[PDB]
Design a binder for this molecule. Structure first.
Ligand SMILES: Nc1nc2c(CN3C[C@H](CO)[C@@H](O)C3)c[nH]c2c(=O)[nH]1
Ligand SMILES: Nc1nc2c(CN3C[C@H](CO)[C@@H](O)C3)c[nH]c2c(=O)[nH]1
Ligand SMILES: Nc1nc2c(CN3C[C@H](CO)[C@@H](O)C3)c[nH]c2c(=O)[nH]1
Lengths: 283, 285, 287
């Protein structure tokens, strides 16, 4: 895989090529690339020009790294991400997270599109990620598998406090004081590898396990971020309701997923701006 | 693993070495190879003579591809299949499915032996597969992993309609007018990788997940078939009741599995006959 | 698919047999913080894993990385002082390599031990849970040490695991233990393997509870599958080293230092238990 020097080489490339010094990294998921629009003094790198960066092969993933200020805050944004289903091993999927750490980032915001498993969710809802279920992790697909480098973190990091409690309370609070539009949802995200969508029986499995939303990303990035000590916040856009009975003739499809992101673009933009305000400055 | 041209080469080899032109492909699982017996005008290929075909290493898997007519319908049958527990990557396990598509097949019938998890099933029951749970797929073992080729299908295919609803309706109706003793069962098949058989605690996990029958195949072939637009029908022969308590001195074993297929041969042969009568003809000949 | 040939296992076995006069009947694999179980071996002869042909290396704290032959309560034993885990980067054929070596040495009984997180709310830190059964989550998805061509010199293509943990040993150990006036009962339950190396989320803890697991760890199962495949009698137990976090209010977190400390606290109870255990292992039919 990647040596420590590989991560350092990439971080040094970025640090040499930009004056931006980000505090927060944001990973934009399927159809959420629009979150880069409000960056000021934006500087763009195509992933292809960044040493060791994988390529985004999925539609709705632009494949660019954008530095700028978001609500005055120094950010770096992955406009597009990587997925196991593309053929990438998790050490590639998660590579940018350790680079961000080496750039000086102290907070990772992870975003995604997700299928709703909890019947109370509607398409267009934002679900705050309170926790996850790492199904690939259980079987061996964990980005920390292999020799541990103490320069990044511990051999056996805990994940029970992965999603930052303070930011979650603040976000929930702020959306109470609105009382406008749908309320902010909260729940458990389960990662499945994909790329095919779930059967009805699989939908019922994931529900029985206690997941509220399902997708094919995010969890590995969180694990790596927590290993290197980043504060983590996550949310899903619920882009479709997972099919849960044999009567329906509806089927999950990627077109509908991207369409739901386009529709929620302004709402997501607002949410992320309020989010930045809840991140404390470094010491 | 395989290039688009690899699939092409194999399909052209077959198209150039037989005049048979199948509409239906049938994959015969453990102890089910006898389903080939009623083929008329049979032409046999050993897998070893077919470019790019993997080899069947499991007992009760003959490793032959047979072309012929089954109750008057033009079929190609896998007498034996491949399993990930043999060492094969899923792109090898499922290779033939994409070949079948290129041969002009529009329907895939997948068969297997399976261990009964639903206590209402008896050894010798046929269970129609209404749905599946893909446990390896959750963790990354899906035959679609990697770059997608649009010449086969979509990057993100849906699976919630994988097992053709109309065929299942017709098979159930037709079978319940034939007044046979044991009813035709219907349920959810769960794939596990194996090759070791389940513990009691594992059996209870699978039951809790909602599975009726468990085996170690089939699901990857269905995913690949649905990706390329094939109509899919599946059934399991329940060959053993999975062990469910710590008192029992009985154990799952492969010999009992094959024996159950032997005993069920006449019931299978008849089922497969009314199955063929439930497969739509193509719009144009 | 397995990276080792039959001859690789043979070579390692012959090397050991030609470098010690010890001829073990019982192999014992010592888990995290349980390496002290070797302290009571008499006539102990130690090999570093690094000097044994084909042996993997233990890279985890609390795993010494030594193979120790000797007598335990009068019985000929070989003990792995430290083991290997999938999370270290090893394929399962490497993790489980020693088990087939033990079979070639003449061992007929494998005792597997580990530290484990408690999922059953009745367990307390320091409890010994006898393993009645396991749930092999990596196995379901393809990570099984038997994957690939099968060598009938070791065992069957499709071995059963429903009787993996020897009932008779478990009945004898429980009975003997009960008659010795110990205040805290031996526990008994199902161990679930997850790959790690990160510890469980609360949601994951709840999944594992709902699946019927009593304790969770990151080892053991592969070794048992290989042991049963080649016909070894198997006994297993876990030291419950921590209660897995199961609510969002707690500020406590699983951590490896506390895991190792729990093994230190339990050294004496574990020593005494492994003695009752050795007395519960049948002798071979012939000497
Ligand atoms: N597993 C899964 N993932 C998603 C997603 C998340 N991603 C959306 C994209 C395919 O549209 C993949 O990267 C998965 C949205 N809806 C679903 C769903 O119903 N199921
Ligand atoms: N997992 C599992 N599979 C089967 C099967 C199906 N296959 C039968 C064959 C071994 O007998 C393997 O390819 C699995 C029958 N019974 C069982 C069972 O109890 N369990
Ligand atoms: N998964 C898991 N394993 C353990 C273990 C067992 N091992 C202890 C060591 C990390 O301390 C790893 O090899 C796993 C103890 N407690 C726990 C737990 O809470 N969870």
């Amino acid at each position: 895989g990647y040596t420590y020097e590989d991560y350092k080489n990439t971080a040094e490339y970025l640090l040499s090529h930009t004056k931006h010094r980000p505090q927060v990294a944001i990973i934009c998921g399927s159809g959420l690339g629009g979150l880069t629009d409000k960056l000021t003094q934006a500087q763009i790198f195509d992933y292809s020009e960044i040493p060791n960066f994988p390529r985004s092969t999925v539609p709705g993933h632009a494949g660019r790294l954008v530095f700028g200020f978001l609500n005055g805050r120094a950010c770096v944004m992955m406009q597009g991400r990587f997925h196991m289903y593309e053929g990438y091993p998790l050490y590639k999927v998660t590579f940018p997270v350790r680079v961000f750490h080496l750039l000086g980032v102290d907070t990772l915001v992870v975003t995604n599109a997700a299928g709703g498993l909890n019947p109370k969710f509607e398409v267009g809802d934002i679900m705050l990620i309170r926790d996850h279920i790492n199904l690939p992790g259980f079987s061996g697909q964990n980005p920390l598998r292999g020799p541990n480098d103490e320069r990044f973190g511990d051999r056996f990091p805990a994940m029970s406090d992965a999603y930052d409690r303070t930011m979650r309370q603040r976000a929930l609070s702020t959306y109470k004081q609105m009382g406008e539009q749908r309320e902010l949802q909260e729940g458990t995200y389960v990662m499945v590898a994909g790329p095919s969508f779930e059967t009805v029986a699989e939908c019922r499995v994931l529900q029985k396990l206690g997941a509220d939303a399902v997708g094919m990303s995010t969890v590995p990035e969180v694990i790596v971020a927590r290993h290197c000590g980043l504060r983590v916040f996550g949310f899903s856009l619920i882009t479709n309701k997972v099919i849960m009975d044999y009567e329906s003739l509806e089927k999950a499809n990627w077109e509908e997923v991207l369409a739901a992101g386009k529709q929620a673009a302004q709402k997501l933009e607002q949410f992320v701006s309020i989010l930045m305000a809840s991140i404390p400055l470094p010491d």
